[PDB]
């Protein structure tokens, strides 16, 4: 539960938005890169594992599953690197709806930002603070604190 | 308590490492930039506040306190932008000792990374996972979860 994350990569403005979703809470972290490579994915996971207690990551495609650089970052950070096959079919739909929602929010903020990366961070902020009533930012803290105790 | 962070800026390798410290726990987030500007500081705080519930930020110097762009980001994210004057004199020493310890760790990992920014995220990871006995990553989750309940 508490330590499982899923990677997700979506496209906007000719650039790539790489997202990590904490599966149990729906909390996300994201970045904009020019294209998805093993090196960028590896650095993103190293950032994520220094901030939250990442036990497993379901990678977003077979290229990042195979990547030696992603394997090296996952070894360094103590992450079990797993596939991200939707064994639960409802998963494809949940990720897709999340990408649609994030793009809708980016569009709503995009004119308040010079750079796409700012708009994506504004969307991350709105997504994690939205109350559904607890927000995803509350749920992920709740879940991890319960695990620690 | 739970929502107070302090900014800190240190130099290495001709680049700048910008750090946000959650004061109550000692947990940190950091990034490498070519130089500290209001625009970079503002984007860093937007990232921080999408990830943790940031109520107040003690800025690291008067230029980032005055910056219109830092004020805009703090307004956008609902952060109270405050000075970072060490009213408690022990604060100068605590930040200084942190920068010294982070640079020590960066030197210990630096040959495992091509880019400095990877070494700084390795240092962030080691700093936040070290047990003092709870780690700073444990303490910030505990503190925030206690606030939520």
């Amino acid at each position: 539960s508490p330590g499982i994350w899923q990677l997700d990569c979506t496209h906007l403005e000719g650039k790539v938005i790489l997202v990590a979703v904490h599966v149990a809470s729906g909390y996300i972290e994201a970045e904009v890169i020019p294209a998805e490579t093993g090196q960028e994915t590896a650095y993103f996971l190293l950032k994520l594992a220094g901030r939250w207690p990442v036990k497993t990551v379901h990678t977003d495609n077979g290229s990042n599953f195979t990547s030696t650089t992603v394997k090296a970052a996952c070894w360094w950070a103590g992450i079990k690197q797993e596939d991200g096959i939707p064994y639960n079919p409802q998963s494809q739909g949940v990720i897709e709806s999340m990408n649609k929602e994030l793009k809708k929010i980016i569009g709503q903020v995009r004119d308040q930002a010079e750079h796409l990366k700012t708009a994506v961070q504004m969307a991350v902020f709105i997504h994690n603070h939205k109350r559904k009533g607890y927000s995803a930012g509350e749920r992920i803290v709740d879940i991890i604190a319960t695990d620690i105790q | 308590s739970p929502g107070i962070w302090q900014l800190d800026c240190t130099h290495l390798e001709g680049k700048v490492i910008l750090v946000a410290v959650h004061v109550a726990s000692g947990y940190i987030e950091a990034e490498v930039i070519p130089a500290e500007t209001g625009q970079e500081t503002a984007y860093f705080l937007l990232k921080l506040a999408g990830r943790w519930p940031v109520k107040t930020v003690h800025t690291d110097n008067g230029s980032n306190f005055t910056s219109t762009t830092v004020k805009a980001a703090c307004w956008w994210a609902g952060i109270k932008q405050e000075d970072g004057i060490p009213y408690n004199p022990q604060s100068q020493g605590v930040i200084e000792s942190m920068n010294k310890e982070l640079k020590k760790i960066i030197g210990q990992v630096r040959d495992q990374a091509e880019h400095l920014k990877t070494a700084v995220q390795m240092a962030v990871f080691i700093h936040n996972h070290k047990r003092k006995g709870y780690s700073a990553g444990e303490r910030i989750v505990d503190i925030i979860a206690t606030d939520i309940q």
Partner: peptide, 8 residues
């Protein structure tokens, strides 16, 4: 480059 961030 046999680095964690670039294993080439």
């Amino acid at each position: 480059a046999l680095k964690i961030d670039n294993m080439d």
